[PDB]
């Protein structure tokens, strides 16, 4: 199951 | 800006024997950037029915791909993999050597 919250660099 | 040369291996899925269907593999690994061209050759002719793995990478960030095709080895047929990449001033041809 993928991470639900990727955030910008 | 980072450039690493692919290490190319050409090999069969199973021990090669004349008259049995096998799979011919070209594994390319250790490369950066991801843009790469890989053809499998039968008597120097580009094999058209060729699948490849999904682009992935190792812990050091360098990419790997597997190219593969069903084949039936015989005594006379010569197989090879031809690889091009920014790190190579010309395409590199690696011959299949069954007897390794």
């Amino acid at each position: 199951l993928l991470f639900g919250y990727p955030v910008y660099v | 800006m980072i450039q690493r040369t692919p290490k190319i291996q050409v090999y069969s899925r199973h021990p090669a024997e004349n008259g049995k269907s096998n799979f011919l593999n070209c594994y390319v690994s250790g490369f950066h950037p991801s843009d790469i061209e890989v053809d499998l050759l039968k008597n120097g002719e580009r094999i058209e029915k060729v699948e490849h793995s999904d682009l992935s990478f190792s812990k050091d960030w360098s990419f790997y791909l597997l190219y593969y095709t069903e084949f039936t080895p015989t005594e006379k047929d010569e197989y090879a993999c031809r690889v091009n990449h920014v790190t190579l001033s010309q395409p590199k041809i690696v011959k299949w050597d069954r007897d390794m």
Binding site: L2, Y8, V9 | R13, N25, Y27, D54
Partner: protein, 275 residues
């Protein structure tokens, strides 16, 4: 044995030739189970292992939504990093991302990780405490400050230490026959004369799973490390792996050399020889 779940993401900008390429793959140990490719027809997260096919439509729709948010995140990053490093609009650049979690042989959390690279070089990576980032340069310290804000740090924590772990275990159960297996290497040696005074000895390991293996040559007990050609472990294509190690031996000296194989499949490390 111990187990892992990892996702790997690559984005490559292609100025003038449309949107950046985006590829995502997930793996349990050394078995791929899902893919997304921005250039494919479907625009969906796709099964790549028989055992993941049993997941329902909520899974597929949600992973597709999620993988597309990763895609969009990377598409912004590519512009951000080009601005951070003062690079031109005309060149192609790569971002890579890997995260996931390890469990021990009791299936409890061992470690969680999340690493990012720009143009093949380390950018930022999460330490074992799941709180502190190791930042490569000044540009990555800016990233560090964003990502260590407590709300954000907590979503990541709760993923790696909880969700990642729970779903790995679920996958391990659902894919038992594939994933909870150990295939011992089938080993043999070959010998080839390169001249009438020298011979190549090659130690082979075939049909093994997992991929982790150590293959080393010894001469009367001393490690022949700088004189061994050792190829990268490679997939056979059927779910198992292959490797060889070769030494060039002056002819007449074959019995001096032993090959040593370590693999979690072997009950005892093997020693192979020309006697």
């Amino acid at each position: 044995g111990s187990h892992s779940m990892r996702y790997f993401f690559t984005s490559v900008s292609r100025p003038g030739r449309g949107e950046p390429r985006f590829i995502a793959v997930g793996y349990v140990d050394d078995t791929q189970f899902v893919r997304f490719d921005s250039d494919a027809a479907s625009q969906r997260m796709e099964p790549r292992a028989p055992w993941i096919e049993q997941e329902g439509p909520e899974y597929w729709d949600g992973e597709t939504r999620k993988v597309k948010a990763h895609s969009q995140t990377h598409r912004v990053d590519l512009g951000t990093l080009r601005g951070y490093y003062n690079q031109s609009e005309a060149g192609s650049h790569t971002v890579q991302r890997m995260y996931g979690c390890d469990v021990g042989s009791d299936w409890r959390f061992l470690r969680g990780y999340h690493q990012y690279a720009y143009d093949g070089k380390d950018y930022i990576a999460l330490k074992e405490d799941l709180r502190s980032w190791t930042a490569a340069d000044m540009a990555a310290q800016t990233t560090k400050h964003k990502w260590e804000a407590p709300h954000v740090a907590e979503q990541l924590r709760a993923y790696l230490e909880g969700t990642c772990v729970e779903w790995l275990r679920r996958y391990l159960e659902n894919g038992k026959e594939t994933l909870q297996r150990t295939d011992a290497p089938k080993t043999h040696m070959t010998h080839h004369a390169v001249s009438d005074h020298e011979a190549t000895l090659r130690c082979w390991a075939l049909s093994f799973y997992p991929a982790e293996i150590t293959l080393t040559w010894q001469r009367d007990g001393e490690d022949q490390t700088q004189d061994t050609e050792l190829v990268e472990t490679r997939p056979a294509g059927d779910g198992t792996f292959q490797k060889w190690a070769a030494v060039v031996v002056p002819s007449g000296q074959e019995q001096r050399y032993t090959c040593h194989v370590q693999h979690e499949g072997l009950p005892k490390p093997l020693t192979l020889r020309w006697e």
